[PDB]
Amino acid sequence: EVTPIQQLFLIKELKPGIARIGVIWDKNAANRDEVLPQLQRASAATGIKVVVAEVASLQEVAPQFRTLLRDHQVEALWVLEESGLLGQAAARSFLIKNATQAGMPVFAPSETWLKEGACVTWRKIRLVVNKAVAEAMGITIPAKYQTAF
Known about the structure:
Blueprint: H1 4-14, E1 20-26, H2 32-46, E2 49-55, H3 58-72, E3 77-78, H4 89-101, E4 106-107, H5 111-115, E5 120-123, E6 126-129, H6 131-136
Parallel strand pairs: 1-2, 1-3, 3-4
Antiparallel strand pairs: 5-6
PDB class: transport protein
Keywords: substrate binding protein, SBP, substrate binding domain, transport protein
Assembly: monomeric
């Protein structure tokens, strides 16, 4: 129930001065009609550039993720849902491990991701945080939100 705009504003609070964020998006997910335009409106509202790399199958996850880094110098990974491809354990573990190795936190759609090393997720608005990863990534939670841990 936390909307993409609400999510991005929270990211903005968590990483002041963030300029560019990368999304890996399942081409085949539902509400693609709803969500991609929400992402553009959230980008506009926050001033954070949202670069979307779409993926249709597992073999596309590694090269599309690396495009976000090669071509767009993104500062974090943001995953919006997990109904299909992004619900596959292989896709999830690849993304978290590679984001982490690259130095960037992952903002995720469910707590399963946090258990595997993602940084933050949401519930309705309350943050849910993997404090060990936040601490290592230099991310301070605002006292005002101080959250499920």
